[PDB]
Structure formats: C-alpha cells, structure tokens
Amino acid sequence: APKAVLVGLPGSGKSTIGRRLAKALGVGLLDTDVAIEQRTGRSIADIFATDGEQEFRRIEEDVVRAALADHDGVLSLGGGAVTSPGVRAALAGHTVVYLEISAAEGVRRTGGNTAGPDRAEKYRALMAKRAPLYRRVATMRVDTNRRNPGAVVRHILSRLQVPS
Numbered sequence: 001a002p003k004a005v006l007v008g009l010p011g012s013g014k015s016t017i018g019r020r021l022a023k024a025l026g027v028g029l030l031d032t033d034v035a036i037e038q039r040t041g042r043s044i045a046d047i048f049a050t051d052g053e054q055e056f057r058r059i060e061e062d063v064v065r066a067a068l069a070d071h072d073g074v075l076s077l078g079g080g081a082v083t084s085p086g087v088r089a090a091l092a093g094h095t096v097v098y099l100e101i102s103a104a105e106g107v108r109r110t111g112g113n114t115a116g117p118d119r120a121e122k123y124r125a126l127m128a129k130r131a132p133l134y135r136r137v138a139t140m141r142v143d144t145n146r147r148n149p150g151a152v153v154r155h156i157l158s159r160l161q162v163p164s
C-alpha cells in the first residue's frame with residue numbers, strides 16, 4: 001500500500017509536491033497518468049478523445065487498483081480518477097493526502113490553462129465538481145493555498161511518521 005496517495009486539482013502543485021515528497025521519503029513515485037500510457041502505448045488525449053471518458057476511466061481504475069496493491073511509495077492520482085465510484089471505493093483504508101486550494105487560487109494560478117474561449121468557466125466547473133470528491137476520500141487535508149512546496153512536504157512528513 002502506498003505511503004501516500006496524493007490528490008489535487010490542476011494548480012495545486014500536485015506533480016511538484018509528489019516529486020518532492022517521494023525524494024524526502026526515499027520512495028518510488030508512481031503517476032497513474034504515466035502508468036496508463038506505459039501500459040497502453042497510447043496517450044491520454046488519444047484514449048480520451050478516441051474511446052471517450054467512460055472507457056478512459058475504466059482503464060484508469062484498473063491501473064489505480066493495481067497500484068494501490070503493488071506500490072509502497074508515493075502514488076500520484078490523475079485528477080479525474082476520483083470521479084469513478086470504484087476508485088473512491090478502492091481508496092478506502094489508504095492514506096490519502098488532499099492538496100487543497102481555493103477555486104479563486106486555482107483560477108489565479110491557471111486558469112483554466114491546464115476548451116477555447118470558455119476554459120476559465122469550465123475550470124471553475126471542474127473544481128466545483130472534483131473538490132467535494134477529494135474532500136470525501138481524503139484522510140489528510142493540506143491547505144496548499146499559500147504554503148511553498150517544501151513547507152507542504154514538511155507538514156505532510158510530520159503527520160506520516162512511523163514508530164518508534
């Protein structure tokens with residue numbers, strides 16, 4: 001089981017914090033988005049655009065599930081994997097670290113540069129949709145709104161200790 005499963009919206013710094021946290025812990029980093037491509041020989045765009053979301057999510061959940069069983073390090077979850085009820089089910093009992101930001105801060109950082117003229121509106125809609133799901137599955141919630149990456153990581157490590 002992973003030491004930490006990281007979840008967050010675009011703009012939360014999830015990739016960056018995952019790399020940093022895995023380096024602080026001395027553990028493997030598995031990015032589920034990368035694993036799908038490594039396993040399918042197809043890009044995310046190509047799967048998502050060709051097969052459609054439902055099939056992408058089916059593929060994702062299978063990869064998420066395997067990693068949850070196999071990976072002992074940090075697992076960085078693709079941003080929409082939480083939208084699948086089976087992912088939310090499989091997550092239960094894991095350490096799930098939610099890299100939490102406000103929608104205003106998301107928009108400030110991105111936004112929604114992560115669609116055409118409406119992309120900001122869709123990004124506002126994306127986070128209204130995903131953020132309650134991240135809240136639901138979290139076991140640790142970390143306000144990354146104003147912390148730097150090293151501070152977020154220091155905060156996480158102090159709440160993931162192991163006896164003695």
Ligand SMILES: O=C(O)C1=C[C@@H](O)[C@@H](O)[C@H](O)C1
Pocket residue numbers: 033044077078079080081
């Ligand atoms: O928010 C999303 O739905 C996605 C985010 C990325 O992690 C990829 O899994 C893909 O672009 C889908």
